[PDB]
Amino acid sequence: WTATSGSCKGRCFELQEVGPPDCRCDNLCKSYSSCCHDFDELCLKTARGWECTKDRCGEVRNEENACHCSEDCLSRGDCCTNYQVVCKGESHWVDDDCEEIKVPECPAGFVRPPLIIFSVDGFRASYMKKGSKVMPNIEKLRSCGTHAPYMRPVYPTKTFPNLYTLATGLYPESHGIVGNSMYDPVFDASFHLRGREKFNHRWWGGQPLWITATKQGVRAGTFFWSVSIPHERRILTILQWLSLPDNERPSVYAFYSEQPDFSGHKYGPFGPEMTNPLREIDKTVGQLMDGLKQLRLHRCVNVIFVGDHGMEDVTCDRTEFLSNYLTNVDDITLVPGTLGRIRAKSINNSKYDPKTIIAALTCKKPDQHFKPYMKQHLPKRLHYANNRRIEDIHLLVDRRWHVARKPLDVYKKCFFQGDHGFDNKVNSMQTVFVGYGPTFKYRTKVPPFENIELYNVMCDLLGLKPAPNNGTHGSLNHLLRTNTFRPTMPDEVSRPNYPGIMYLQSEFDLGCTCDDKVENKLEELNKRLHTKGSTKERHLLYGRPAVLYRTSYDILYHTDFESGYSEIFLMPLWTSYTISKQAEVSSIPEHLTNCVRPDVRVSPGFSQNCLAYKNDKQMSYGFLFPPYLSSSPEAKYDAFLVTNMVPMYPAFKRVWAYFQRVLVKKYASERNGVNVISGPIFDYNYDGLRDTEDEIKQYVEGSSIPVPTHYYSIITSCLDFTQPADKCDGPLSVSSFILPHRPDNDESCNSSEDESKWVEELMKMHTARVRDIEHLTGLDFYRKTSRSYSEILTLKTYLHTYES
Numbered sequence: 052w053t054a055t056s057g058s059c060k061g062r063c064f065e066l067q068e069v070g071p072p073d074c075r076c077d078n079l080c081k082s083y084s085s086c087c088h089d090f091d092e093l094c095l096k097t098a099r100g101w102e103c104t105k106d107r108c109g110e111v112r113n114e115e116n117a118c119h120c121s122e123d124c125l126s127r128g129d130c131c132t133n134y135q136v137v138c139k140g141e142s143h144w145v146d147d148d149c150e151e152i153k154v155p156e157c158p159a160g161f162v163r164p165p166l167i168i169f170s171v172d173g174f175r176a177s178y179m180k181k182g183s184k185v186m187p188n189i190e191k192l193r194s195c196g197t198h199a200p201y202m203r204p205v206y207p208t209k210t211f212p213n214l215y216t217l218a219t220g221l222y223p224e225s226h227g228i229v230g231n232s233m234y235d236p237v238f239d240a241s242f243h244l245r246g247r248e249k250f251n252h253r254w255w256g257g258q259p260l261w262i263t264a265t266k267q268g269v270r271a272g273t274f275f276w277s278v279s280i281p282h283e284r285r286i287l288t289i290l291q292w293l294s295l296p297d298n299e300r301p302s303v304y305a306f307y308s309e310q311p312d313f314s315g316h317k318y319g320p321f322g323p324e325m326t327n328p329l330r331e332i333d334k335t336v337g338q339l340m341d342g343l344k345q346l347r348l349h350r351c352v353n354v355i356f357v358g359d360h361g362m363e364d365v366t367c368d369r370t371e372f373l374s375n376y377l378t379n380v381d382d383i384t385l386v387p388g389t390l391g392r393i394r395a396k397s398i399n400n401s402k403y404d405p406k407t408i409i410a411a412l413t414c415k416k417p418d419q420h421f422k423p424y425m426k427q428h429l430p431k432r433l434h435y436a437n438n439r440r441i442e443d444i445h446l447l448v449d450r451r452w453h454v455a456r457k458p459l460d461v462y463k464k465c466f467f468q469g470d471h472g473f474d475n476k477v478n479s480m481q482t483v484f485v486g487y488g489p490t491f492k493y494r495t496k497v498p499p500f501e502n503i504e505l506y507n508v509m510c511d512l513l514g515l516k517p518a519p520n521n522g523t524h525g526s527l528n529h530l531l532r533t534n535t536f537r538p539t540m541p542d543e544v545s546r547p548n549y550p551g552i553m554y555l556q557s558e559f560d561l562g563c564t565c566d567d568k569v570e571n572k573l574e575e576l577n578k579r580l581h582t583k584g585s586t587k588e589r590h591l592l593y594g595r596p597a598v599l600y601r602t603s604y605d606i607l608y609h610t611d612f613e614s615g616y617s618e619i620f621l622m623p624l625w626t627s628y629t630i631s632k633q634a635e636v637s638s639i640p641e642h643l644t645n646c647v648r649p650d651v652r653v654s655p656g657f658s659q660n661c662l663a664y665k666n667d668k669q670m671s672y673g674f675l676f677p678p679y680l681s682s683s684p685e686a687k688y689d690a691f692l693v694t695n696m697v698p699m700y701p702a703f704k705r706v707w708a709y710f711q712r713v714l715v716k717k718y719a720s721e722r723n724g725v726n727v728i729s730g731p732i733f734d735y736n737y738d739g740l741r742d743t744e745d746e747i748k749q750y751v752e753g754s755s756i757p758v759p760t761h762y763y764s765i766i767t768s769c770l771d772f773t774q775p776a777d778k779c780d781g782p783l784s785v786s787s788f789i790l791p792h793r794p795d796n797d798e799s800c801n802s803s804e805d806e807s808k809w810v811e812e813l814m815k816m817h818t819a820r821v822r823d824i825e826h827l828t829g830l831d832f833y834r835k836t837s838r839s840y841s842e843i844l845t846l847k848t849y850l851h852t853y854e855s
């Protein structure tokens with residue numbers, strides 16, 4: 052209940068919202084049906100429109116007008132944005148030459164350059180080039196400031212998940228807004244775009260920018276605007292707030308446009324109807340910048356132009372129906388559209404079985420346009436599992452398609468031509484980033500980056516300490532002229548042991564055999580030098596990874612590779628090796644097929660055993676350093692050490708053997724050598740973070756050998772590919788992956804074919820950042836390069852996407 056009989060007199064767009072039952076005058080009161088009775092009259096004035104004309108110049112102030120062209124307007128802070136242009140012979144901001152902003156040029160009493168976030172819904176990255184002729188204001192921000200060719204949203208590429216990731220620096224799994232629609236089983240409550248539940252604070256986790264600011268003594272404009280407040284009024288409200296007294300004036304503001312998303316849904320991303328919405332957004336930018344120029348703030352404010360997600364061509368005819376797959380369609384609830392989320396319609400139904408639903412959805416039709424996943428099997432780069440609001444069963448929908456439960460859902464609720472929500476690596480989902488102002492660089496292009504990184508930079512622009520978030524603070528220092536964040540590398544927590552030869556072969560009772568009895572003090576000296584690390588500079592190019600947790604581990608050197616061997620997990624945390632462009636692939640000799648050799652540097656009690664793999668009828672083994680890439684027949688024996696062995700499902704060994712035998716050589720050929728770091732990952736609670744030993748749900752039968760959930764590889768070379776990976780003087784180039792360790796290839800519908808037709812496709816789907824691998828292993832890579840630490844942070848956030 053609201054007492055709407057109070058008044059908005061002197062309270063229009065007040066910054067502190069009042070508590071029910073008192074009536075509201077803030078920019079969200081309409082959305083709560085809580086505005087005072089006189090809000091429209093006083094606060095949403097329209098008379099005479101948004102623009103000064105030659106006949107209004109010097110007019111007698113009339114308080115009914117939407118904006119003023121009277122001599123007193125600059126002093127009151129409520130001039131029409133074009134006042135100085137029409138009435139005082141000034142130029143529009145867009146007509147002025149770009150001039151470098153080396154220092155903030157602020158009015159007296161400004162403590163810091165304000166930040167204005169200009170957020171646009173559905174603004175696809177390619178609009179910057181394809182619409183450039185109709186967006187001169189946006190084009191000038193872009194060419195004069197700092198811009199990325201695109202900015203990667205988070206999955207799912209929906210509005211609220213992305214806007215709240217911009218506000219928090221958190222993945223949706225961590226902030227709690229995991230969709231535009233959600234069921235929380237603990238609350239037994241549903242979140243929807245329409246209605247009141249979505250206003251309850253219990254949905255919204257982490258700490259958004261406006262709260263971070265307020266807690267650190269920085270005032271904030273309210274970021275959310277009720278849909279019926281016209282854009283012109285939003286901009287006039289921000290400009291009036293910027294005229295408030297010093298002690299009352301916010302330092303951070305947001306503008307929001309529902310366009311171009313609203314029109315994109317109706318007309319498709321590139322419908323001829325899309326030109327007008329782009330022109331109108333550009334005009335709104337023009338109004339802001341002309342208004343800042345009037346207040347002498349156009350060389351003071353940092354402006355960010357940012358989108359939430361792009362827009363793809365999607366039509367009602369490109370819908371898959373679960374009713375064409377399942378017998379039991381009335382027993383499930385589907386969250387539908389550009390992703391699917393499935394749960395039981397009733398928790399009372401004991402016949403519901405996720406295993407049977409997955410199997411009925413798996414490679415059933417030859418061109419199926421969706422793929423089912425248990426959420427823990429989704430590509431780790433999506434970070435979309437660790438939340439009770441994310442259903443166990445997920446459908447990754449192909450770009451251009453929808454999934455629905457039954458046909459009547461699509462025509463009893465069409466005419467839409469655009470949609471978004473797909474995998475956040477799809478080109479059509481990419482969105483925009485421009486930064487303009489004293490703190491941003493001048494005429495600077497930066498590589499594409501993820502939207503989870505922006506919170507940290509917005510905190511830097513405002514002198515704020517960020518709440519704990521998923522950005523990597525410093526990775527975007529190259530966007531900034533000043534206010535850079537200069538972090539120190541994390542301290543190593545565990546120092547390695549360097550074991551020498553300590554065990555006789557007869558002490559090992561592992562049930563292993565190797566045909567390796569083949570008896571020269573030239574080569575006996577050499578053997579010893581390789582075991583002490585004489586080749587370690589070729590194979591460990593960027594230093595030893597640091598272990599950032601308490602554990603027991605050994606560094607093991609060999610001719611062709613170096614490893615950090617965990618005495619707790621009985622396998623390497625990491626294996627590092629370099630493959631030159633000239634390197635030769637060889638076979639595993641016939642006599643060495645089943646060869647496993649005790650490591651006389653490592654106790655029997657800290658070793659795997661072959662008898663466990665023999666008894667485990669589901670589990671086999673592979674090697675981290677591939678025997679196929681041995682430098683010599685003699686060096687190949689090293690690759691069959693028990694300390695190089697890791698547990699692998701036979702189905703996964705098909706993937707791993709193709710990677711090691713074919714793809715490593717291919718990358719060294721293409722990139723002029725590569726350095727490879729490979730290893731296991733254990734994430735049984737799918738939280739994206741390294742498991743402790745007590746979290747492991749599967750062992751090799753009858754043993755303490757834990758079974759990885761994933762295998763990673765980090766593949767590094769010289770960005771200037773005219774230099775070999777091992778003699779690179781400049782920046783690096785990296786690609787990585789985190790491959791699910793699965794006992795079947797059900798994910799790969801073409802897996803009955805030769806690995807050359809499916810394995811590289813799988814690996815591209817499971818592309819990762821080095822930072823993703825850092826979280827999952829507790830390792831810190833690239834500790835010893837010639838490069839600046841911020842540059843290394845940028846490299847560790849790189850994702851190789853494989854989009855054209």
Ligand SMILES: *[C@@H]1O[C@H](CO)[C@@H](O[C@@H]2O[C@H](CO)[C@@H](O[C@H]3O[C@H](CO[C@H]4O[C@H](CO)[C@@H](O)[C@H](O[C@H]5O[C@H](CO)[C@@H](O)[C@H](O)[C@@H]5O[C@H]5O[C@H](CO)[C@@H](O)[C@H](O)[C@@H]5O)[C@@H]4O)[C@@H](O)[C@H](O[C@H]4O[C@H](CO)[C@@H](O)[C@H](O)[C@@H]4O[C@H]4O[C@H](CO)[C@@H](O)[C@H](O)[C@@H]4O)[C@@H]3O)[C@H](O)[C@H]2NC(C)=O)[C@H](O)[C@H]1NC(C)=O
Pocket residue numbers: 221222224225226227253254255256257434437438439519520521738739740826
């Ligand atoms: C991205 O970046 C984020 C932020 O840095 C990071 O997420 C953080 O990771 C930590 C580990 O997973 C975790 O630390 C502690 O969590 C709780 C404290 O939780 C509350 O307090 C903070 C501070 O304000 C809140 O932010 C937090 O918000 C979460 O929950 C809200 C309400 O439930 C919700 O609105 C919000 O969205 C958010 O949900 C998310 O996180 C939770 C977990 O906190 C998930 O469950 C959700 O799914 C969602 O993902 C809370 O209100 C501490 O209590 C923990 O300590 C436990 O657990 C330890 C075991 O490892 C143990 O040592 C401790 O002694 C203690 O044990 C006790 O409790 C156990 C579990 O209940 C029990 O089994 C045990 O036997 C014993 O009784 C953690 O220290 C942060 O909360 C988390 N923050 C946020 C904002 O998410 C991410 O990891 C990265 N992601 C990547 C990939 O890097």
Ligand SMILES: N#Cc1cc(Cl)cc2c1C[C@@H](Nc1ncc3c(n1)CN(S(=O)(=O)C1COC1)C3)C2
Pocket residue numbers: 168170210211214215216217218244274275276277305306307309
């Ligand atoms: N969180 C956050 C955040 C972070 C930044 Cl950096 C900027 C902004 C926001 C919030 C944003 N304002 C805003 N105002 C109103 C509305 C929205 N956003 C989104 N909707 S909607 O209902 O989802 C949509 C579909 O029909 C309209 C209405 C401005």
Ligand SMILES: [Ca+2]
Pocket residue numbers: 172173209210211312359360
């Ligand atoms: Ca949106």
Ligand SMILES: [Ca+2]
Pocket residue numbers: 733734735736737738739740741742
């Ligand atoms: Ca984990």
Ligand SMILES: [K+]
Pocket residue numbers: 664665666667668669670671
């Ligand atoms: K076996």
Ligand code: NA
Pocket residue numbers: 796797798799800801802803
């Ligand atoms: Na298959």
Ligand SMILES: [Zn+2]
Pocket residue numbers: 173210312313316471
């Ligand atoms: Zn939309």
